[PDB]
Amino acid sequence: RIKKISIEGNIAAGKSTFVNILKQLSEDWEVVPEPVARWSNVQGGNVLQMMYEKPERWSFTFQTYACLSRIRAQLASLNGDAEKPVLFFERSVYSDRYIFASNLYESESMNETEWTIYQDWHDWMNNQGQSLELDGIIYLQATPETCLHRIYLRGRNEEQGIPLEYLEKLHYKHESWLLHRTLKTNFDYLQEVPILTLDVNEDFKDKYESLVEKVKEFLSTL
Template identity: 25%
Template structure:
């Protein structure tokens, strides 16, 4: 299959999103490396509360959530100072989805506190030219997480993943800030399969309208 043209010819700022195990960071990194964009990626290894959250979610949900919030806000503040017209960017998070995790893990009092902090910190982040939302069933995500073998993720439950998948689905059902490409990754592996990657890039270049669903059958 011939190499596709660069998606940066059409979109200068792309964000790849999806639940844990969907492959958003790997795909964002591959797009950046293949076409010469600048990656703007989450850095979960820097969160000192994340491993403890996976072991004891009730106790460490709030500090883990706030650390990620501050980290993302700082990244977006740096991003806002760049020349977006001369630099192609690929991110793996939307700040708008941050409360999704908070609503899933925090109790009412903690959520109220988190929301106050979120509202006070939220920067005027640039709206992406395109969002790629990677979908997969909870069972598929659970198996992918198990296979990649990151020790701190070993305590993630399938029930938590089900709640996360449902929350993502509801969030993107209402998302309309940017054009949205919804990609079902059950039978599509654009991270490891070159042909699938080329198919995805062609889909980006040929996309019409603000909401498109892309899937391959078995």
């Protein structure tokens, strides 16, 4: 019943900022924030930090918890009577698996066993899920350079050592999935989901007017 729109894009592209703006446009519109605070303080251990520090040890543990915490929050938001309700997800279980987890496996931060377990867990976990299927995707496109700068602006302690090259790899995965559309998932419906690509490289005064209305254009078509 609720339209579910995922906001995708690289680390610090400006997804939280944008959706928190967008949501004031309508009482019918709510956000499900990416549960990053629950990753910083496991409840507490900093599993986010452990993964950045020791990715060969902690990537699988991190990735499983990330995805579980997202499903939990997204499902909780669907449960709690509006004209045209829209729920904006900050990222999705598909970016969890096909971007982040996948990149860790490609980097050898998860081994073949860990990647197999992750995929089997993800397959089953989402096959139960079901009510989380997306009606649309908004891709906020920023260059890895922009993302690096915004990382510094925001000042999340765990993120400060992130190298440009890591952001580059993440950028290429997003481009393969959402712009080139060469990234194959095993979720069949996903190949028919409309994607709205917004460029957010400029300082926010420069284009935010046009961006909000593009989202308005987009949502009325779903």
